[PDB]
Amino acid sequence: GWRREGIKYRRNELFLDVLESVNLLMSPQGQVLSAHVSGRVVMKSYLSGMPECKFGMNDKIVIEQSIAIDDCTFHQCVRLSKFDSERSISFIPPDGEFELMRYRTTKDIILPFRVIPLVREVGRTKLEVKVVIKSNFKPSLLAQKIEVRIPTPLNTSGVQVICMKGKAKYKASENAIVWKIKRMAGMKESQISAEIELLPTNDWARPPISMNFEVPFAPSGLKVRYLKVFEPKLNYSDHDVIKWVRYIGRSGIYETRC
Amino acid sequence: DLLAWDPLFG
């Protein structure tokens, strides 16, 4: 139902895209209040004929570094009977691009950044706000598009702010200090320090510090182990197919209370 | 960024 007969390519090739959103709510005492990963695998293929495919990943059930999938669904092309009976993912794919699988995880997530805030209320007219970020992943990988958003009080008079890497700006319109870093390798750390002058009132209610980032790995811990291909009439296998995988991990709602 | 694509061998 998913694929027309008679497809022919000179170059048999496929691309797997592992796309994940990592979500966190962290207490000021470094307690994880909530975390999850929403993931999907997108397959784009140019395969001749009616290839029989198998997708292998580091699922705990077949490997007992393996991962706990809480829930998943698959494209209609996947044989659910074989996933229930063997934990095998077996299909004849659509041609071109489709979403093979979508999944959710909560256990043993790699939280790519640790956010360590320090807030000192000095008098009733001054706040000192410091944040350290630490990249918790291999030193050979680069995070990119890093943003740290630090909320400011509605009675902010002025901000002075410096940081050890990247650039930071007070955006009064957004009641935030916005810290941007273009790239940061794993097992690194940086720091921002702000002095917030406050307007005196008679008599703070802090939102969380949020991050944006992209990392070149699955924070679920998902690794693609194989994509087996067999076309029985054309008699080509794996060895005849050029195969690629990319991992893109993005922040979703990634909040650390201060 | 094509450097983000890794080969799948086997």
TrEMBL record, chain A:
Residues 11-257 form the MHD domain. The keyword Cell membrane applies. A 1,2-diacyl-sn-glycero-3-phospho-(1D-myo-inositol-3,4,5-trisphosphate) binds at residues 167, 169, 171, 180, 182. It is found in: Cell membrane; Membrane, Coated pit. Its main location: membrane. GO terms for biological process: clathrin-dependent endocytosis; intracellular protein transport; negative regulation of protein localization to plasma membrane; postsynaptic neurotransmitter receptor internalization; regulation of vesicle size; synaptic vesicle endocytosis; vesicle budding from membrane. GO terms for cellular component: AP-2 adaptor complex; glutamatergic synapse; postsynapse; presynapse. It is a peripheral membrane protein. GO terms for molecular function: disordered domain specific binding; lipid binding; signal sequence binding; transmembrane transporter binding. Keywords: Cell membrane, Coated pit, Endocytosis, Lipid-binding, Membrane, Protein transport, Transport. Signal peptide: none annotated. Belongs to the adaptor complexes medium subunit family. Component of the adaptor protein complex 2 (AP-2). Adaptor protein complexes function in protein transport via transport vesicles in different membrane traffic pathways. Adaptor protein complexes are vesicle coat components and appear to be involved in cargo selection and vesicle formation. AP-2 is involved in clathrin-dependent endocytosis in which cargo proteins are incorporated into vesicles surrounded by clathrin (clathrin-coated vesicles, CCVs) which are destined for fusion with the early endosome. This is AP-2 complex subunit mu. It comes from Rattus norvegicus (Rat). The lineage of its organism: Eukaryota, Metazoa, Chordata, Craniata, Vertebrata. The chain holds residues 158 to 433 of 433 of the full protein.
